Design a binder for this molecule. Structure first.
Ligand SMILES: CC(C)CN(C[C@@H](O)[C@H](Cc1ccccc1)NC(=O)O[C@H]1CCOC1)S(=O)(=O)c1ccc(N)cc1
Length: 330
């Protein structure tokens, strides 16, 4: 089997991407944030505290003939941005672009934190990291990909995110028309539960490529590119007037600047992020100070290859018995 679904930016800045998911019988369609850096599938629901729902589409398990409460199971998650959610758990039928899993754990939110309430475009998360990070207690649950894996033609999914445009998630096959050149595969460590790999270096604009190992995670759920402070300083030094602002929370730059590209290494291959991909616009409406798309990972504890980097590539999440990651230019 295979599946394919279109993923769409939530706004004009690519602040996140949403993908339609069918849940239950008859189907209930929710727009979820596919997140290769977490492992819970959770949704806004008829159980969510009413004051914490503001425009999201909700899952109502009592209207689904295939929903069954998973007795005694609860879940509670806290994310890297300080947001959180928690609730109870049903099993139900879940499909993504034609690919169906029966008995998927659907974690129904009873509480969500303010940043989820305030974002009316995201109805939940669909985690695609390793199931070792799933938070369901006392019986841990599997991700949608882990449940589908054995049925798929090949045990893979791919991410092809667009810059200011829609893109595609495919399950079970590699679309060889979607990239240029060849796919370079690189080794993965699953010890922390993430798609964790090692980049071979970087360059700023047309400058000299620096060979240096950069450990980090491939994360569709993170908007920006978070890298070591030495690397990020080298980038922004090439933008006149750019500086790190403690009060805003990162590097900002004059909106009048033209940004250089940023290249990262995958083995001997090279992925080029165009400068325009690194512009996230005015810090507040009407401001001439703009927020940068490359930021320091200091204080996170981990480097994160988020959407700013992933949308410049065709990315293969290979879930063979020894997982790997593949990157191609496009
Ligand atoms: C709800 C999603 C988006 C949560 N984030 C992305 C996730 O992939 C996030 C990535 C991450 C991993 C490790 C350390 C720090 C961050 N994983 C995460 O925290 O995993 C926890 C829960 C399970 O085990 C560990 S985010 O980083 O908070 C974020 C928030 C807002 C924006 N605009 C962009 C990113």
């Amino acid at each position: 089997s295979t599946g394919s679904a279109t993923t769409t930016p939530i706004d004009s800045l690519d602040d996140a991407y949403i993908t339609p998911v069918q849940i239950g019988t008859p189907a209930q369609t929710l727009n979820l944030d596919f997140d290769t850096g977490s492992s819970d599938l959770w949704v806004f629901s008829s159980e969510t505290t009413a004051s914490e729902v503001d425009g999201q589409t909700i899952y109502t398990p009592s209207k689904s003939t295939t929903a069954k409460l998973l007795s005694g199971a609860t879940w509670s998650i806290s994310y890297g941005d300080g947001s959180s959610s928690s609730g109870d758990v049903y099993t139900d039928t879940v499909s993504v672009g034609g690919l169906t899993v029966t008995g998927q754990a659907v974690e129904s939110a009873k509480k969500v934190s303010s940043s989820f309430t305030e974002d009316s475009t995201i109805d939940g998360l669909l985690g695609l990291a390793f199931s070792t990070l799933n938070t369901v207690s006392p019986t841990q649950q599997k991700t949608f990909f882990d449940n589908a894996k054995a049925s798929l033609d090949s045990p893979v999914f791919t991410a092809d995110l667009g810059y200011h445009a829609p893109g595609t998630y495919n399950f079970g096959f590699i679309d060889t028309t979607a990239y240029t050149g060849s796919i370079t595969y690189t080794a993965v460590s699953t010890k922390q539960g993430f798609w964790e790999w090692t980049s071979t270096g970087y360059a700023v604009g047309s400058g000299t490529f620096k060979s240096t190992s950069i450990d980090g995670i491939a994360d569709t759920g993170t908007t920006l590119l978070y890298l070591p402070a030495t690397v990020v300083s080298a980038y922004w030094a090439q933008v006149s007037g750019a500086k790190s602002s403690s009060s805003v929370g990162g590097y900002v730059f004059p909106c009048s600047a033209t940004l250089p590209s940023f290249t990262f290494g995958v083995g001997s291959a090279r992925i080029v992020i165009p400068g325009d991909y690194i512009d996230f616009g005015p810090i507040s409406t009407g401001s001439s100070s703009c927020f940068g798309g490359i930021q320091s990972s200091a204080g996170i504890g981990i480097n994160i290859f988020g959407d700013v980097a992933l949308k410049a590539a065709f990315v293969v999440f290979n879930g063979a018995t020894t997982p790997t990651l593949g990157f191609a230019s496009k």
